[PDB]
Amino acid sequence: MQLFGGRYDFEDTEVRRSNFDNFPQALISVFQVLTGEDWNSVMYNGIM
Amino acid sequence: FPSAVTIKSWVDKMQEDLVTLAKTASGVHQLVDIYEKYQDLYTVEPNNARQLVEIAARDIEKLLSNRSKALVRLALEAEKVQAAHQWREDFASNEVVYYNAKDDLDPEKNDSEPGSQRIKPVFIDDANFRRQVSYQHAAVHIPTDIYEGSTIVLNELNWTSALDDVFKKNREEDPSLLWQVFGSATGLARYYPASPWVDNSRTPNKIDLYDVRRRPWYIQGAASPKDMLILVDVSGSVSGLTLKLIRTSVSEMLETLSDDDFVNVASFNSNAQDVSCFQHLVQANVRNKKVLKDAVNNITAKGITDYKKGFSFAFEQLLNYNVSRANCNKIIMLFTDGGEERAQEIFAKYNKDKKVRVFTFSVGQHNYDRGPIQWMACENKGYYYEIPSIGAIRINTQEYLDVLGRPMVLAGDKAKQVQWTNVYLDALELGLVITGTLPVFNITGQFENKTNLKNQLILGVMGVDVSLEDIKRLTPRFTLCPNGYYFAIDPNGYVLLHPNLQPKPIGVGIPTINLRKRRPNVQNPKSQEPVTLDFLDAELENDIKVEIRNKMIDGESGEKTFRTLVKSQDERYIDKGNRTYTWTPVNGTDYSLALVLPTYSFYYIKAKIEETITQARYSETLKPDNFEESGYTFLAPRDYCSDLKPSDNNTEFLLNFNEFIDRKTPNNPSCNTDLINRVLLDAGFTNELVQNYWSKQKNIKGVKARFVVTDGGITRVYPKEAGENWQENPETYEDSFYKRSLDNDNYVFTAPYFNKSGPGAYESGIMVSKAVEIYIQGKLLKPAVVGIKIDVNSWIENFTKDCKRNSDVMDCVILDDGGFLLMANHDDYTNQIGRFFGEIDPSLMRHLVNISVYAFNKSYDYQSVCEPGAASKQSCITEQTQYFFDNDSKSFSGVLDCGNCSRIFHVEKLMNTNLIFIMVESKGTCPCDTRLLIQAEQTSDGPDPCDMVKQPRYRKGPDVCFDNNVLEDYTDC
Ligand SMILES: *[C@@H]1O[C@H](CO)[C@@H](O[C@@H]2O[C@H](CO)[C@@H](O[C@@H]3O[C@H](CO)[C@@H](O)[C@H](O)[C@H]3NC(C)=O)[C@H](O)[C@H]2NC(C)=O)[C@H](O)[C@H]1NC(C)=O
Ligand SMILES: *[C@@H]1O[C@H](CO)[C@@H](O[C@@H]2O[C@H](CO)[C@@H](O[C@@H]3O[C@H](CO)[C@@H](O)[C@H](O)[C@@H]3O)[C@H](O)[C@H]2NC(C)=O)[C@H](O)[C@H]1NC(C)=O
Ligand SMILES: *[C@@H]1O[C@H](CO)[C@@H](O[C@@H]2O[C@H](CO)[C@@H](O[C@@H]3O[C@H](CO)[C@@H](O)[C@H](O)[C@@H]3O)[C@H](O)[C@H]2NC(C)=O)[C@H](O)[C@H]1NC(C)=O
Ligand SMILES: *[C@@H]1O[C@H](CO)[C@@H](O[C@@H]2O[C@H](CO)[C@@H](O)[C@H](O)[C@H]2NC(C)=O)[C@H](O)[C@H]1NC(C)=O
Ligand SMILES: *[C@@H]1O[C@H](CO)[C@@H](O[C@@H]2O[C@H](CO)[C@@H](O)[C@H](O)[C@H]2NC(C)=O)[C@H](O)[C@H]1NC(C)=O
Ligand SMILES: *[C@@H]1O[C@H](CO)[C@@H](O[C@@H]2O[C@H](CO)[C@@H](O)[C@H](O)[C@H]2NC(C)=O)[C@H](O)[C@H]1NC(C)=O
Ligand SMILES: *[C@@H]1O[C@H](CO)[C@@H](O)[C@H](O)[C@H]1NC(C)=O
Ligand SMILES: *[C@@H]1O[C@H](CO)[C@@H](O)[C@H](O)[C@H]1NC(C)=O
Ligand SMILES: *[C@@H]1O[C@H](CO)[C@@H](O)[C@H](O)[C@H]1NC(C)=O
Ligand SMILES: *[C@@H]1O[C@H](CO)[C@@H](O)[C@H](O)[C@H]1NC(C)=O
Numbered sequence A: 001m002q003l004f005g006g007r008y009d010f011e012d013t014e015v016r017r018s019n020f021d022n023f024p025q026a027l028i029s030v031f032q033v034l035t036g037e038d039w040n041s042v043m044y045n046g047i048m
Numbered sequence B: 001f002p003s004a005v006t007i008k009s010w011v012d013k014m015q016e017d018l019v020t021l022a023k024t025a026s027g028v029h030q031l032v033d034i035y036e037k038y039q040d041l042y043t044v045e046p047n048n049a050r051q052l053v054e055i056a057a058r059d060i061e062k063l064l065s066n067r068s069k070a071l072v073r074l075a076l077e078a079e080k081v082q083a084a085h086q087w088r089e090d091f092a093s094n095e096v097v098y099y100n101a102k103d104d105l106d107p108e109k110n111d112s113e114p115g116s117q118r119i120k121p122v123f124i125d126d127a128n129f130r131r132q133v134s135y136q137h138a139a140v141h142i143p144t145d146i147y148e149g150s151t152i153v154l155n156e157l158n159w160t161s162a163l164d165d166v167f168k169k170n171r172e173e174d175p176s177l178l179w180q181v182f183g184s185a186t187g188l189a190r191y192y193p194a195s196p197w198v199d200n201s202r203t204p205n206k207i208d209l210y211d212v213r214r215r216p217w218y219i220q221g222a223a224s225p226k227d228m229l230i231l232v233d234v235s236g237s238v239s240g241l242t243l244k245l246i247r248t249s250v251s252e253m254l255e256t257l258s259d260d261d262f263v264n265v266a267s268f269n270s271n272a273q274d275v276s277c278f279q280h281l282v283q284a285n286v287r288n289k290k291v292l293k294d295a296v297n298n299i300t301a302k303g304i305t306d307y308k309k310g311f312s313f314a315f316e317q318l319l320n321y322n323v324s325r326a327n328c329n330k331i332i333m334l335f336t337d338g339g340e341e342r343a344q345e346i347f348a349k350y351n352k353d354k355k356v357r358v359f360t361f362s363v364g365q366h367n368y369d370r371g372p373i374q375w376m377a378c379e380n381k382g383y384y385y386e387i388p389s390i391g392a393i394r395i396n397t398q399e400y401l402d403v404l405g406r407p408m409v410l411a412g413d414k415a416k417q418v419q420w421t422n423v424y425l426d427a428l429e430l431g432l433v434i435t436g437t438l439p440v441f442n443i444t445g446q447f448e449n450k451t452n453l454k455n456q457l458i459l460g461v462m463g464v465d466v467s468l469e470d471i472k473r474l475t476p477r478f479t480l481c482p483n484g485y486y487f488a489i490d491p492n493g494y495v496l497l498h499p500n501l502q503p504k505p506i507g508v509g510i511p512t513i514n515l516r517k518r519r520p521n522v523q524n525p526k527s528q529e530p531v532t533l534d535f536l537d538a539e540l541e542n543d544i545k546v547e548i549r550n551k552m553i554d555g556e557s558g559e560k561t562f563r564t565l566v567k568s569q570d571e572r573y574i575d576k577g578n579r580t581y582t583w584t585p586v587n588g589t590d591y592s593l594a595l596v597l598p599t600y601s602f603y604y605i606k607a608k609i610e611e612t613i614t615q616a617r618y619s620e621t622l623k624p625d626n627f628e629e630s631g632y633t634f635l636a637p638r639d640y641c642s643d644l645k646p647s648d649n650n651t652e653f654l655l656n657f658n659e660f661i662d663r664k665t666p667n668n669p670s671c672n673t674d675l676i677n678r679v680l681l682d683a684g685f686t687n688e689l690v691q692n693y694w695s696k697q698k699n700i701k702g703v704k705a706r707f708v709v710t711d712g713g714i715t716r717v718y719p720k721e722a723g724e725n726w727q728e729n730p731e732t733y734e735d736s737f738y739k740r741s742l743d744n745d746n747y748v749f750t751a752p753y754f755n756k757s758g759p760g761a762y763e764s765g766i767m768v769s770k771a772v773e774i775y776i777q778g779k780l781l782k783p784a785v786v787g788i789k790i791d792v793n794s795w796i797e798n799f800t801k802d803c804k805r806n807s808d809v810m811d812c813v814i815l816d817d818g819g820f821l822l823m824a825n826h827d828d829y830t831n832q833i834g835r836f837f838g839e840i841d842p843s844l845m846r847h848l849v850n851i852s853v854y855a856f857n858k859s860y861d862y863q864s865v866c867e868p869g870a871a872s873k874q875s876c877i878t879e880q881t882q883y884f885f886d887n888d889s890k891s892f893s894g895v896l897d898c899g900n901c902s903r904i905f906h907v908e909k910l911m912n913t914n915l916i917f918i919m920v921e922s923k924g925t926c927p928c929d930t931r932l933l934i935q936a937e938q939t940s941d942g943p944d945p946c947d948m949v950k951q952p953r954y955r956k957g958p959d960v961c962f963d964n965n966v967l968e969d970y971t972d973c
């Protein structure tokens, strides 16, 4: 939330559900990264 | 340097040589005599300027009465028929039979859509419609993203199917009536006569974006003018997708505004400011809307939201009254995402009386609270909208007109006033049209006052198209010289009628394209803007013209004679001309009509040839078989009558005219007798001139071609071989040299076009023309203009015989008024004849302009074809420079300098012509050259838009408009 919260403001129409905008969504994203499924997409979103 | 005496002698001898050549070869005196010799085959009739404008205004008003009577009929029938609808939801058993436009015409389509049945029309080809139409029914257009066959659409189709009878009745009552359309509030458009859509949905690669609710006629008929303020949230939270969505939404919302609305775009993030250089409401025309769009596409998101400051800014902007406004619909159109502050105290302080509406938009996908903006919406009599994606923009930025129409509906029959739009290009490729509109009200349970729930909204807008060619048919121009003309203006400055109005769209700024980001198969939108050209932008602007336009805007009638500057048909010369403007108001509407007449065109010629053999011989004079005896003949493609059509090919049109005149007697039971008689008289007089004078001297040294162009549509060029070199328009009224000769009272030299495909330099010659003036009972008339194509080689032999061929000591050139080179002395400049002299010797030209021998002014052409820049052809603005003589002195002697350099010059104006002779020290003596002086169409972007808003042109708004009805419900957001 500190690092990526409110920073996914991309000027495109792509949908990025796995973000860190609030606590439940950040918790879901962290759980998804722990499961290892599509974590690289989250990393790419954080890098961009 | 030679003394002034010898230069004066040389220029004198040259001028008498040229004048004698032109006078003795063209034959002005012989033509004048043969016009005066007969004096009985024709009569001189006055052009009563005061009366003609009155008849034309009455004709225009009565045509608009035609069109208005057909609108009230349709509106009443639509109201009555929809008042008796049942609103069923079972259409499978009872199919709805209609002809859908933009569908394949193949008989094997077999759509068989549930609840609908299609119609296959015959589609005969008919005139007054440049396409194939069917009068057996009406066509229906439905937007591509709107599903046909839904309950709402299918219910509209039957109750609108009763409009076909009234469509047919209106057509049969007035056969010359164009499109009749009903644009529904559900998106449908039912128009008559039936015709396939210009751009079908997806049968080819191209697609159409046509929603009837966004058309200017529908928008003007759906609500009253507005004082709009777009408030944009640029705080930090709107960063990302919602910011681009807001930008697109604001551009689309600006696209819904017309010239009678006033808009300004503000922006707030913990501080409120303006997005552009306007600082107050502006007229919201094409230029101002372009500026606002450019400013909106340039904003960024940063800061903390503060609704109080933004709303305070919006209310202070709406409370200005220091500037021109509409004073009708004060609305704040707030684009945002979501918040937690509703700013009740600001609304209590500024909008206690609820005189200002608020429409709120929540844009994008976000988790922010939407309650406060809904409260803002349906607390201040406004509305609330959600725009989650691009595809939801267009529909959601046009529904605010439904709310604005509630007071108009509640006003009742007082709100059914026929309105007319600006000039715009028809969507069905018909040209420039104006549409008369009339709203249609939903009256269900009106006699009992039962529901009154959806009856506050309109069913749609009825419209009838009127083509500008229909209006031009009520203002004939062939009884006046090619210099006079009609023109009509709005109470807004825009011209409904003008010779300089063209079907091209109005350009704004420099056209910049980026072809590196355009896919080949994306089908970008083309345009939807109207052709709004101001009166002052259609002609050269004086101070007298401004006051004339102001006096004629606010419904006044009068006349004014003065002296003005007139630009030529080719944007190269400017003449000083006597003019008289006579203007009157059209009683039924807000248009004002004026007639422009020069002093010499107060009388015209009416032919009195009545007996047979004279007309027969005058008719056989113009036949190709004896052109060798009477020179190549050109005939103006005028509407002599509807049997023969203009062809744009002069040979075939002349053959058709000749065979039509031979086939039936000139009694003309159903053809314009005046035009034909005038043409025959002109042909006879011109043939007499050619046979009696020109044929006597079969070939003479100096000339290449001798031509005569007369008022009536006869052009004759004596050498047939020179006929192929004749590139002039066969229509006399569209010849630049003809009008230039009419304006001037001397011989006029026309510079050939330089560096263009076609023989125009040596094979043709230099054109010199003079107008024929006659006096019958002391009344001046200018019926014809004669002219000569002087050979370049013989003129060179005249010229050389210090000015010697390829001399390295002197420069000897001849220019015309306008600074175009006709002859030089070095045979090097002679290769470029007709080039602007400021482009080969810019220093001397600049100094000549400085010493006030060549005046110039610049104008803006707002409809120009333009090669797109980098940042095939688009529309933009160009700047045109025109040069002319201002100071009446004859000889100017001086010396130009360049920095430790000096060149002596002497220029002399030739008598009885428009020519100047220049002798100067050679340009190669000292190498001084700063920049080229270009006289050409220069693509531009000015004038500065937010400098014209500080002092704008005079304007009149609509007198009556509807707002703030106490019976309004407004319980919907
Ligand atoms: C510049 O070129 C001109 C043509 O290219 C020359 O113009 C011709 O000059 C002739 C002699 O001056 C004229 O001849 C006489 O002209 C008048 C006309 O009626 C009369 O004096 C005589 O009838 C006639 N002589 C004849 C016919 O033998 C030509 O008429 C005249 N051309 C035209 C069309 O009028 C200029 O001479 C020439 N300039 C110089 C300096 O040579
Ligand atoms: C929309 O569709 C409906 C149904 O197709 C139309 O209603 C139909 O109207 C016709 C003529 O008005 C009716 O025909 C008449 O039927 C009566 C018997 O009911 C008969 O005695 C008459 O001689 C005549 O044939 C038809 O019955 C009626 N259908 C239904 C289901 O009511 C409706 O008119 C259409 N909308 C508009 C605006 O016309
Ligand atoms: C003009 O206004 C009238 C009412 O003032 C509109 O008629 C009303 O239309 C609505 C739907 O738009 C009807 O509601 C529907 O009723 C059916 C039952 O018949 C129901 O099954 C639907 O779910 C829906 O609720 C309403 O009954 C109807 N009222 C009357 C008195 O006809 C009319 O639609 C308006 N005109 C246009 C072009 O919209
Ligand atoms: C334009 O609006 C301004 C408001 O800023 C008006 O200026 C005020 O006018 C009142 C009335 O005379 C004065 O009492 C104030 O002192 C003025 N304020 C300022 C800052 O000048 C102005 O009158 C309006 N009209 C014009 C033509 O400027
Ligand atoms: C309709 O237009 C005509 C223009 O011919 C107006 O007629 C003139 O109106 C003025 C002012 O009312 C009078 O002084 C003239 O005497 C009228 N001329 C004639 C020949 O009648 C007429 O007024 C217009 N209609 C209305 C209702 O104003
Ligand atoms: C068109 O050219 C004329 C030149 O005659 C310009 O008229 C002059 O304008 C200057 C500049 O203001 C004045 O000082 C002169 O007094 C004007 N002369 C006359 C005779 O009126 C005119 O301004 C030009 N038109 C435009 C639109 O610039
Ligand atoms: C207006 O309508 C009437 C009646 O149909 C017709 O006689 C008249 O010619 C129309 N006006 C014009 C300008 O066509
Ligand atoms: C507007 O756009 C121009 C680019 O043409 C840019 O230079 C300018 O900074 C922009 N304005 C703002 C306020 O960012
Ligand atoms: C134009 O007006 C002036 C001034 O009244 C007059 O002298 C002249 O004859 C008129 N016609 C012209 C210049 O053709
Ligand atoms: C105009 O002249 C220049 C050089 O004099 C030449 O390069 C150019 O092609 C010419 N324009 C046309 C249209 O031929």
Ligand SMILES: *[C@@H]1O[C@H](CO)[C@@H](O)[C@H](O)[C@H]1NC(C)=O
Pocket (backbone or CB within 6 Å): B850
């Ligand atoms: C051009 O004309 C202006 C007119 O005020 C004058 O001041 C200036 O000196 C002139 N240019 C030159 C080079 O003399």
Ligand SMILES: *[C@@H]1O[C@H](CO)[C@@H](O)[C@H](O)[C@H]1NC(C)=O
Pocket (backbone or CB within 6 Å): B887, B888, B889
């Ligand atoms: C033309 O110029 C001369 C000298 O420059 C001057 O005396 C004369 O008044 C001018 N004529 C005008 C301005 O009409």
Ligand SMILES: *[C@@H]1O[C@H](CO)[C@@H](O)[C@H](O)[C@H]1NC(C)=O
Pocket (backbone or CB within 6 Å): B899, B900, B901, B926
């Ligand atoms: C004018 O002065 C410059 C600088 O002193 C010099 O280079 C140039 O040659 C001079 N011009 C002539 C014609 O001598």
Ligand SMILES: [Ca+2]
Pocket (backbone or CB within 6 Å): A036, A037, A038
């Ligand atoms: Ca995986």
Ligand SMILES: [Ca+2]
Pocket (backbone or CB within 6 Å): B235, B236, B237, B238, B304, B305, B338, B339
């Ligand atoms: Ca915010």
